[PDB]
Amino acid sequence: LRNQQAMAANLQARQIVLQQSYPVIQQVETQTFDPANRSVFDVTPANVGIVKGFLVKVTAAITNNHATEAVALTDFGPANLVQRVIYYDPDNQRHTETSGWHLHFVNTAKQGAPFLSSMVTDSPIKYGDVMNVIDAPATIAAGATGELTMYYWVPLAYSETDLTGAVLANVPQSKQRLKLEFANNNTAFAAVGANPLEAIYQGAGAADCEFEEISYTVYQSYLDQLPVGQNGYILPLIDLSTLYNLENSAQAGLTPNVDFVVQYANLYRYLSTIAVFDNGGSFNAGTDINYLSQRTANFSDTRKLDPKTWAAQTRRRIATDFKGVYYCDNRDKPIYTLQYGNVGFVVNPKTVNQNARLLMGYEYFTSRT
Amino acid sequence: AALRNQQAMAANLQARQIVLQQSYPVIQQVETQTFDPANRSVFDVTPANVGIVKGFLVKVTAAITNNHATEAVALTDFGPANLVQRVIYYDPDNQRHTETSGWHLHFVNTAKQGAPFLSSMVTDSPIKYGDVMNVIDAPATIAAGATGELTMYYWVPLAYSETDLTGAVLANVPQSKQRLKLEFANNNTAFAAVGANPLEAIYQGAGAADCEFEEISYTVYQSYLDQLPVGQNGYILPLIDLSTLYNLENSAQAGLTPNVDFVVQYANLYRYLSTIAVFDNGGSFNAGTDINYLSQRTANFSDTRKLDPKTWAAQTRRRIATDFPKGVYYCDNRDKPIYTLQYGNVGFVVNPKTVNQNARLLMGYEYFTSRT
Amino acid sequence: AALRNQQAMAANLQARQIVLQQSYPVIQQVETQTFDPANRSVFDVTPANVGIVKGFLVKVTAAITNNHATEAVALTDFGPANLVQRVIYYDPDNQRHTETSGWHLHFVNTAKQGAPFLSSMVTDSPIKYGDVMNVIDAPATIAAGATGELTMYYWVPLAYSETDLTGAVLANVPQSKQRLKLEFANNNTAFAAVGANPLEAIYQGAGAADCEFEEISYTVYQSYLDQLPVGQNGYILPLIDLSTLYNLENSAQAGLTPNVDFVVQYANLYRYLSTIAVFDNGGSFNAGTDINYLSQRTANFSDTRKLDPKTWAAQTRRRIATDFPKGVYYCDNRDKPIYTLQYGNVGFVVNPKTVNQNARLLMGYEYFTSRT
Amino acid sequence: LRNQQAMAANLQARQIVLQQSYPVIQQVETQTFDPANRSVFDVTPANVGIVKGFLVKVTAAITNNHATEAVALTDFGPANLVQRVIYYDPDNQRHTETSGWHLHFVNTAKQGAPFLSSMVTDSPIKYGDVMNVIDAPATIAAGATGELTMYYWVPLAYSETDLTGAVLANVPQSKQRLKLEFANNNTAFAAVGANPLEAIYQGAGAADCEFEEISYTVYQSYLDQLPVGQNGYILPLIDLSTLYNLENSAQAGLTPNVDFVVQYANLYRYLSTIAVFDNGGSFNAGTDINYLSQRTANFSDTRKLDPKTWAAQTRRRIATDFPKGVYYCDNRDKPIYTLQYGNVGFVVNPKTVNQNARLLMGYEYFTSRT
Amino acid sequence: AALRNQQAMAANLQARQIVLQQSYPVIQQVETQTFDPANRSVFDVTPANVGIVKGFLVKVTAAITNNHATEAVALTDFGPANLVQRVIYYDPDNQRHTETSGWHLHFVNTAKQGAPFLSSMVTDSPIKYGDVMNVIDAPATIAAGATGELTMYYWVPLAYSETDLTGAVLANVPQSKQRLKLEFANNNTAFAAVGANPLEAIYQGAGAADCEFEEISYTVYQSYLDQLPVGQNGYILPLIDLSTLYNLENSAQAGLTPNVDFVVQYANLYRYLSTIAVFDNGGSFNAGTDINYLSQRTANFSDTRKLDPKTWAAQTRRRIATDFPKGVYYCDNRDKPIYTLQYGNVGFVVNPKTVNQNARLLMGYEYFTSRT
């Protein structure tokens, strides 16, 4: 198993790169637009050094033109300012392809607290929500205009110290593609009684809400001044030949008191799983679920838990909860079947409304093969 | 000489790592029961005998009705942490590990998490994170005629942590059961009248005499490692980890007098990781104002951290990001455990400023000790 | 090459025979408990670690009172078979074997007996044979104000049969306990209101909301082989039998549409002995009238038994001498188990005629699979 | 151990006999009589080939001469038309010696369903109780006459394919003896409050019930045209030198909540055990018993079970329950064989014990002619 | 031949001594419950599986109110000894040991103590010893409108004594629980009307129909040996002691007639240590006046102690320092247990002088027998 040698080398090379190169975060593109005209953009990253990820800043002004009715933030709120993201590397290989809300929840899981949030404390010194980094008005009254700010981190590298999934872009001139699909006047506002899953605001005045405008700025984070040796660039070959991706999917067919199993695919090393129980447009705090679990065929469940106990494990990961959104951390021992479906994510629902479904979100590693 | 232990240490650590890398972690429900505290409050749970047991997550829920005609009751400082009065664990060899109060176990759960155990932090996030699932919850007050719902969780540790198996238990002996004893709160412990000692109570107030539990429910989840790794000599196992006890225990001491050092000696042999001291000043729990200072001293008139109450509290804020409740003091000795053999006798000191009738110090300890 | 397995097979069979000839069969009580479902309904039973375990006979009795002022309730199609909601077994190595619903386990008990499990057949005999002992019994209706008494039995298999030890468990590991988890019916699952889904309920009717269990009692009897035979190399044991899992499992699938083939794929590696499909047509259970046909097909557009519901039912009458309840369909593949490796992917097919809201197919499987 | 050779040979010979001979069932005797005059008969079987058993057909007419009271079948009913049976082979050795009801219960255990019964089904085709093979009126009203039919199979051979216990009778002229003792006007009718164990009908009009007449026909089942070889007749010597017998016994001395143990003898290989709890004339559906079991000294119980669970095992054997107070135990695959008298016992721990309580035991066993 | 047992005896005794010298005796609470007999009276207690179990001390308390408007009730002869109606114990192998009435268990507790069980003797001491703690207590009468408080204790033996472990139970089998079943008195058994049979009742009198339990509480304490000694071959254990059953059982027999010997046969295999015979003369319990004589006879028309009632009572006064209650007769055969194998059939004889309707002899036995 010359793997030990490969891994040993990879890790050494990673450390030399981190020690010798210098981190840079640089603006690559900014744009302001009206969702009525366009909402899909293809950003072209710079081809320099080893790319670790992209910080995407999104600001928006929303006007409630209704005569007398207000609207209020949905549970996801500004996290729905970006509906989807897709990244293609210089070799035309896709990495992350997921929803803005799933990307945001992973950003939170990786930080260990609500992403870029300001924690409240008793400090008399005026720390606090001074800069409104991620912010949105709880409600926008009839005739009012609200200002929102949202940030997303699109990862290539797994972390600042683990370059698994990073992309070498000093390489060919072939361009990278960071595709962003923003919310628009058709997705951002939900009428009372409508499904608020993909919306930012919901309420009686929704039909008359509209974007005044949306702006985004993409910052690219990369390592420059890569170290050179005898043969040339000292590089972690395993890190750079591995993909670290986030992906989402939807599953339906839930029935009261019956195990609903979403199979994991083989080949992928699943680091985390998010399951959103969109119960026909209703999002409940565990009351519509009997239990959740992860199960291996012919070896039962490794963590069959009631909803509150499942939530307790999540509180240890992000210091809060995360209605209807369930998280599962498998970072230390990634789900890796080897045989398609040897392992599944389970939800046994207590109550199932019309048009119920589970929206799944995954973080995984897989070789470029 | 002494080199055998240096080798034993490496062998133990090596095996611990193999076990962690090769085994598969499992958390499984072992028992759930709903009961009326008026009928019974003490239960003996028999966990499953599978692989290496790391600990138990105990979920407790309750419905409490305040039947008083006019008066309300309010949560005591410990509140739902007093849903379990005492917890005691015995391994397959019938050896006792943790034997302590629910409140002490809970404060240690908090200390090891680095924040109030399983709490939801408040932030400025517009996204609707927050107290969505009410994992640990209890209404601040229960009005006359109202019913409140509570949820509490306790982690009963065997292993020190998820990565340090010191204290873990090998439960493979068929016919030799482990035992997790839970003594729950009941209608005589949960409700304190005005003026009575609130230490062990959940609610206190003018309506206390008419408060009652409608029911209490518990679910015990057992956390363990399955698929244990096998080698040439059979099961690869960290023998030191599995032959060491990681226990929490509590005690009570009295005899305090104003301005005089009250010293609680640490016993020998035990390696004390943390110490909690609760100054039950005759039923009054004060925010440091009844204390001149606290300290740890190795006899030989030598204090290592003699501090005024606020400065002592500052050290604790560095550990759990907030203060423990009034009258509860914490001391972290995790990196350099108090061990009388390597430092001589040591004691925990409290020099009280004010001492009411029936004053006492309730001590809670976290420690490692050899089975043999 | 492949000849090693041909030898292993003979060695396994030879040892199985020696074990059956030399050992002594024993059925012994391991635990009995009476409880109020309002307090608790989930139990974890720890069986004895003696010799080779073949299975467990679980006796369940209950008293149900219909407290409604005026309305009665009547047995659902499954009735007392729903006294146990779910059963799960784990062996000493903590490996899961059967994990299924009480109703599925019961239908398999029936399939393997060749007649309604433990039933009393009716004959013209003048000698007073008959339902003398009420082994499996439940009143057809419970009137307003009345109390009914029920008795139910389930056989939880480890070994495939009394002569085929495939699936049996060697429980000799001291300190490594087996676990038999029983999740019983309670006041929230046993009684269905008119119009509600009766699938998991015992009684349904206009008085359901006021029905309650007075008590439920269970007794677990463990069947095993003692006095295991010893040879030159020690214990003579069929290694393949003891390293194979014989399990029952159930699942649920939705997405049916009138006149369109609904296909449930069989997983690979498992050798499926029988398949049960329950068409829960949104709470309605019909006698084949909502189905065009059922089949088993090896993909490649090839059905091996595409049949109309009545003809499918005829095959089942040849197996259990009667029909399973409304909406319950059975398929015997015991002599030639469905195995995707030797036939490619295979699926169970139902082409529905009528599909109500919330329709789904509940599948129950009986299968053999390798531990490793 | 030249036994392997003996058994190997025995089995081969058995198969040749079954393959080469031809089965015959033949009437050997019929008789009609009035129980008031006689009720004990000694039937003389034919000495031909290998005898497997006897099918005994019994018919009877019972008249309730009471002025106004009826009677109703007891739990055993027509199974008590024959009170006892005893068979002696040509060598004066006894095989079965038991009661008619025990013989009938074994006939049922061996069939796997109530003996010669007609199962009820939903078939629209008119199968059913067409021929009334085993039949008796549920009640016989005052002044009425009821007609009954009962069949018993007295086995010598264990089954149609296992000739263990069969009898070679082409042998000497020495006669076989099939002794039959029938019910009479003193045993067939039980007064209200009297023990109905041995009776056919019980009720207020019992004192005035009587047999109009009883008739029996014995059919002998045997194998003819036995195969011959070099040394002569090819015969399974082990089969023919082994006795397959049914026997009954009675035991008393039961006390509430105390284990009542009936020891098994040594030498016999007990295939089945039947225990009837005659609780002072009352027969209950397990409610007077705590548990039943089979136990070996210094090795505890191999099947200590509550009455319903014990009954569950029986339901797997005969597809229904035996009558109230009748308990069955199958040990066919691994016969109880002590080697030391009483190493094994049948246990009944009674919950309630009435006056004159006792256990009536019935056994099926194999034993060498020695 | 037979020499193997002579060795086995010495090995058993040697190991018993080592166990007694090396182990540490522990008495520990396993369960406590307070209940209303109107709701429930039968309980199944699951004791702990630790080391060698010697027995259980069961504490029972009760509050009884006589709600009759005018009439009182008075204690029956057995009184508080009837708080427990029946006790049954099953070991981990599900084998039954003691299965008897509370009154019989209590009389044996007395016989083995050599005086009324846990009683306080009266003396002339001026120092205030006496009935200070009311260990076993019950008011002689409960007046109309009054409430009486009772306390009763029973020792349920497994081991024969503190020094003779014959009958003790090794409870180390994980997943195989022991079971101690207690069937308590309730409002239908505890109160006898005037003229009714007082045998099983606690109080009898004209106010009986209106008497009721306010509550009954029990606490089970388990006595066992911990820290079992280990040797070269592992655990040192007296195999004969641990494979022998020491049980108490009771029965009932009827059919007595004036001046005729009524004989109750002793069963074979059992070694009878003591015999108790209660002459329930149709609800009347007399002080020997309804009996001509009692005896023990080895058949063969041979009495070993045919005695008039007063002389029989004299032998008992030598054993317990007083008389058992009216109609209760005791026989000690501890040094030479009745064993039918070594003496042929033996029977206990009562030749009654007077026999009322519904007369019967209730027998209680103490005996040793082999598990196998």
Short mmCIF file of N, CA, C and O in Angstrom, two decimals, chain A residues 19-72:
data_model
loop_
_atom_site.label_atom_id
_atom_site.label_comp_id
_atom_site.label_asym_id
_atom_site.label_seq_id
_atom_site.Cartn_x
_atom_site.Cartn_y
_atom_site.Cartn_z
N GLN A 19 2.92 27.10 4.72
CA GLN A 19 4.03 27.81 5.35
C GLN A 19 4.70 28.83 4.44
O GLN A 19 5.03 29.93 4.86
N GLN A 20 4.88 28.46 3.17
CA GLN A 20 5.57 29.31 2.21
C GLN A 20 4.77 30.31 1.39
O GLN A 20 5.27 31.39 1.06
N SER A 21 3.54 29.97 1.02
CA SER A 21 2.74 30.89 0.21
C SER A 21 2.14 31.99 1.07
O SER A 21 2.27 31.97 2.29
N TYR A 22 1.51 32.96 0.44
CA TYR A 22 0.86 34.03 1.18
C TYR A 22 -0.60 34.13 0.76
O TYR A 22 -0.91 34.17 -0.44
N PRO A 23 -1.52 34.16 1.74
CA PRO A 23 -2.97 34.25 1.51
C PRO A 23 -3.39 35.61 0.97
O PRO A 23 -2.91 36.65 1.43
N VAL A 24 -4.29 35.60 0.00
CA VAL A 24 -4.79 36.83 -0.58
C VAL A 24 -6.30 36.73 -0.74
O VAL A 24 -6.82 35.68 -1.11
N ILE A 25 -7.00 37.81 -0.43
CA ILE A 25 -8.44 37.85 -0.65
C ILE A 25 -8.56 39.09 -1.53
O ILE A 25 -8.11 40.17 -1.16
N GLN A 26 -9.16 38.91 -2.70
CA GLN A 26 -9.23 39.98 -3.67
C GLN A 26 -10.56 40.07 -4.39
O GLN A 26 -11.15 39.06 -4.75
N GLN A 27 -11.05 41.30 -4.58
CA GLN A 27 -12.31 41.48 -5.28
C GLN A 27 -12.10 41.08 -6.74
O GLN A 27 -11.11 41.48 -7.35
N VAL A 28 -13.01 40.30 -7.29
CA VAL A 28 -12.88 39.92 -8.69
C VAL A 28 -14.01 40.50 -9.52
O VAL A 28 -13.88 40.64 -10.74
N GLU A 29 -15.12 40.84 -8.88
CA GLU A 29 -16.26 41.38 -9.62
C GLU A 29 -17.36 41.96 -8.74
O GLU A 29 -17.67 41.42 -7.68
N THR A 30 -17.95 43.06 -9.20
CA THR A 30 -19.07 43.69 -8.50
C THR A 30 -20.09 44.05 -9.57
O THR A 30 -19.72 44.39 -10.69
N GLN A 31 -21.37 43.98 -9.22
CA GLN A 31 -22.40 44.32 -10.19
C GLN A 31 -23.71 44.64 -9.50
O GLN A 31 -24.06 44.04 -8.49
N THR A 32 -24.44 45.60 -10.07
CA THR A 32 -25.72 46.01 -9.54
C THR A 32 -26.73 45.81 -10.66
O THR A 32 -26.44 46.13 -11.81
N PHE A 33 -27.89 45.27 -10.33
CA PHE A 33 -28.87 45.00 -11.37
C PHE A 33 -30.29 44.98 -10.82
O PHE A 33 -30.51 45.07 -9.61
N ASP A 34 -31.25 44.87 -11.73
CA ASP A 34 -32.66 44.80 -11.38
C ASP A 34 -33.13 43.41 -11.78
O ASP A 34 -33.09 43.06 -12.95
N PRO A 35 -33.56 42.60 -10.80
CA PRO A 35 -34.04 41.23 -11.00
C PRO A 35 -35.12 41.10 -12.07
O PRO A 35 -35.36 40.01 -12.59
N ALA A 36 -35.79 42.20 -12.38
CA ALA A 36 -36.83 42.17 -13.40
C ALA A 36 -36.21 41.90 -14.78
O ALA A 36 -36.85 41.32 -15.65
N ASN A 37 -34.97 42.33 -14.96
CA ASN A 37 -34.25 42.15 -16.21
C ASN A 37 -33.37 40.92 -16.29
O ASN A 37 -33.28 40.27 -17.33
N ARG A 38 -32.72 40.59 -15.18
CA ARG A 38 -31.85 39.42 -15.14
C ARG A 38 -31.55 39.00 -13.71
O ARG A 38 -31.57 39.83 -12.80
N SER A 39 -31.26 37.72 -13.52
CA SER A 39 -30.97 37.21 -12.18
C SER A 39 -29.94 36.09 -12.18
O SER A 39 -29.62 35.55 -11.12
N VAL A 40 -29.42 35.74 -13.36
CA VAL A 40 -28.41 34.69 -13.46
C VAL A 40 -27.11 35.30 -13.97
O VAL A 40 -27.10 35.95 -15.02
N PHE A 41 -26.02 35.09 -13.24
CA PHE A 41 -24.72 35.63 -13.64
C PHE A 41 -23.62 34.59 -13.59
O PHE A 41 -23.63 33.71 -12.73
N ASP A 42 -22.68 34.69 -14.52
CA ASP A 42 -21.56 33.77 -14.56
C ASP A 42 -20.32 34.62 -14.28
O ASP A 42 -19.91 35.41 -15.11
N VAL A 43 -19.75 34.45 -13.09
CA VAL A 43 -18.57 35.20 -12.67
C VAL A 43 -17.31 34.45 -13.08
O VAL A 43 -17.23 33.24 -12.94
N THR A 44 -16.33 35.18 -13.60
CA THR A 44 -15.09 34.56 -14.03
C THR A 44 -13.99 34.87 -13.03
O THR A 44 -13.51 36.00 -12.95
N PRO A 45 -13.59 33.88 -12.23
CA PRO A 45 -12.53 34.04 -11.23
C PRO A 45 -11.19 34.28 -11.91
O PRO A 45 -11.04 34.07 -13.11
N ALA A 46 -10.22 34.74 -11.14
CA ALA A 46 -8.89 34.97 -11.69
C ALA A 46 -8.15 33.63 -11.62
O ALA A 46 -8.34 32.85 -10.67
N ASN A 47 -7.35 33.33 -12.63
CA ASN A 47 -6.58 32.09 -12.64
C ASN A 47 -5.22 32.36 -12.01
O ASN A 47 -4.25 32.62 -12.71
N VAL A 48 -5.15 32.30 -10.69
CA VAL A 48 -3.90 32.56 -9.99
C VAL A 48 -3.70 31.66 -8.76
O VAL A 48 -4.60 31.53 -7.93
N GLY A 49 -2.53 31.05 -8.68
CA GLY A 49 -2.19 30.19 -7.55
C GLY A 49 -3.19 29.09 -7.23
O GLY A 49 -3.80 28.50 -8.11
N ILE A 50 -3.33 28.81 -5.94
CA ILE A 50 -4.26 27.79 -5.47
C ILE A 50 -5.49 28.52 -4.92
O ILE A 50 -5.37 29.29 -3.96
N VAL A 51 -6.64 28.28 -5.53
CA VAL A 51 -7.88 28.94 -5.11
C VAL A 51 -8.56 28.14 -4.00
O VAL A 51 -8.77 26.93 -4.12
N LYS A 52 -8.89 28.83 -2.91
CA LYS A 52 -9.51 28.21 -1.75
C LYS A 52 -11.02 28.39 -1.68
O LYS A 52 -11.72 27.53 -1.16
N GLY A 53 -11.51 29.51 -2.18
CA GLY A 53 -12.94 29.74 -2.13
C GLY A 53 -13.33 31.15 -2.53
O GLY A 53 -12.47 31.95 -2.89
N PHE A 54 -14.62 31.44 -2.45
CA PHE A 54 -15.13 32.75 -2.82
C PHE A 54 -16.08 33.29 -1.77
O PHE A 54 -16.96 32.57 -1.31
N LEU A 55 -15.88 34.54 -1.38
CA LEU A 55 -16.78 35.16 -0.42
C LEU A 55 -17.70 36.02 -1.26
O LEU A 55 -17.25 36.91 -1.96
N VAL A 56 -19.00 35.73 -1.21
CA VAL A 56 -19.95 36.47 -2.01
C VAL A 56 -20.81 37.37 -1.14
O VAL A 56 -21.54 36.89 -0.27
N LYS A 57 -20.69 38.68 -1.37
CA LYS A 57 -21.45 39.69 -0.64
C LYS A 57 -22.65 40.08 -1.50
O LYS A 57 -22.48 40.41 -2.67
N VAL A 58 -23.84 40.04 -0.92
CA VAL A 58 -25.05 40.40 -1.65
C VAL A 58 -25.85 41.43 -0.86
O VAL A 58 -26.09 41.24 0.34
N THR A 59 -26.21 42.53 -1.50
CA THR A 59 -27.02 43.56 -0.84
C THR A 59 -28.26 43.75 -1.70
O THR A 59 -28.22 43.53 -2.92
N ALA A 60 -29.37 44.12 -1.08
CA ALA A 60 -30.59 44.31 -1.83
C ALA A 60 -31.52 45.28 -1.13
O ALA A 60 -31.50 45.41 0.09
N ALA A 61 -32.33 45.96 -1.93
CA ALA A 61 -33.34 46.88 -1.41
C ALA A 61 -34.66 46.29 -1.92
O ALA A 61 -34.82 46.03 -3.11
N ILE A 62 -35.58 46.06 -0.99
CA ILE A 62 -36.87 45.50 -1.30
C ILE A 62 -37.95 46.51 -0.93
O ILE A 62 -37.98 47.02 0.20
N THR A 63 -38.82 46.82 -1.88
CA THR A 63 -39.90 47.77 -1.64
C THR A 63 -41.25 47.07 -1.57
O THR A 63 -41.62 46.30 -2.47
N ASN A 64 -41.99 47.33 -0.49
CA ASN A 64 -43.32 46.77 -0.34
C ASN A 64 -44.25 47.87 -0.88
O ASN A 64 -44.54 48.84 -0.18
N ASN A 65 -44.70 47.71 -2.12
CA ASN A 65 -45.58 48.70 -2.74
C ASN A 65 -47.05 48.47 -2.42
O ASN A 65 -47.92 49.15 -2.97
N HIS A 66 -47.34 47.52 -1.54
CA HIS A 66 -48.73 47.24 -1.22
C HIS A 66 -49.32 48.47 -0.56
O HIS A 66 -48.61 49.26 0.08
N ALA A 67 -50.63 48.64 -0.72
CA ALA A 67 -51.30 49.79 -0.14
C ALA A 67 -51.36 49.78 1.38
O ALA A 67 -51.12 50.80 2.02
N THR A 68 -51.67 48.62 1.97
CA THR A 68 -51.83 48.53 3.42
C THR A 68 -51.27 47.30 4.16
O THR A 68 -51.25 47.29 5.39
N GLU A 69 -50.85 46.27 3.43
CA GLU A 69 -50.35 45.06 4.07
C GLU A 69 -48.82 44.92 4.10
O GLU A 69 -48.14 45.25 3.13
N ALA A 70 -48.31 44.42 5.22
CA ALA A 70 -46.87 44.23 5.37
C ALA A 70 -46.48 42.80 5.05
O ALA A 70 -47.33 41.96 4.74
N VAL A 71 -45.18 42.53 5.10
CA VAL A 71 -44.66 41.18 4.90
C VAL A 71 -43.59 40.99 5.98
O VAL A 71 -43.05 41.97 6.50
N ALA A 72 -43.31 39.74 6.32
CA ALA A 72 -42.31 39.45 7.34
C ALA A 72 -41.34 38.39 6.82
O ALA A 72 -41.70 37.56 5.98
#
